[PDB]
Amino acid sequence: VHFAPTITFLESPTSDHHWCIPFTVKGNPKPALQWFYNGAILNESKYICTKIHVTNHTEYHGCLQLDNPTHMNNGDYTLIAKNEYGKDEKQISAHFMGWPGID
């Protein structure tokens, strides 16, 4: 039934770090976006994916989003925007986390 409130758990804060590789693409029809990482196709997943946040008509503003990436995701990312008419390429250097320290 009904009953007074009990706070049965309250703990210290946990965190999450989200990174976004920003871009803008133009095409008509909307261009198919494919990413590559160090020359190899980057298969999108639950930890890394393209999100289009702001839409105009032909102008698409988004990010390749990475959730809690490590120094292992540091590298060169190439975006290829494809269309029925043609395709464009652009690549960018991304650093997310410095390599772990030595001794």
Rounded Cα distance, 70 and 67, in Å: 9
Could you tell me the resolution of this structure in angstroms? 2.1
Cβ–Cβ < 8 Å for 46, 89: no
Q: Which domain covers residue 3, as residue numbers?
A: 1-103
Per the structure, the count of domains in the chain is 1
- Experimentally, the structure was elucidated by X-ray
- Classify 72 as helix, strand or coil: helix
Closest alpha carbon to 90 in 43, 31, 29, 18:
31
Q: Where residue 86 sits, what CATH number does that domain have?
A: 2.60.40.10
Rounded Cα distance, 103 and 101, in Å: 7
Phi, psi of 28 (to 5 degrees): -160, 110
Structure tokens given for 75: 């590298």
Q: Where are the alpha helices (DSSP H) in the chain?
A: none
Closest alpha carbon to 56 in 87, 25, 96:
25
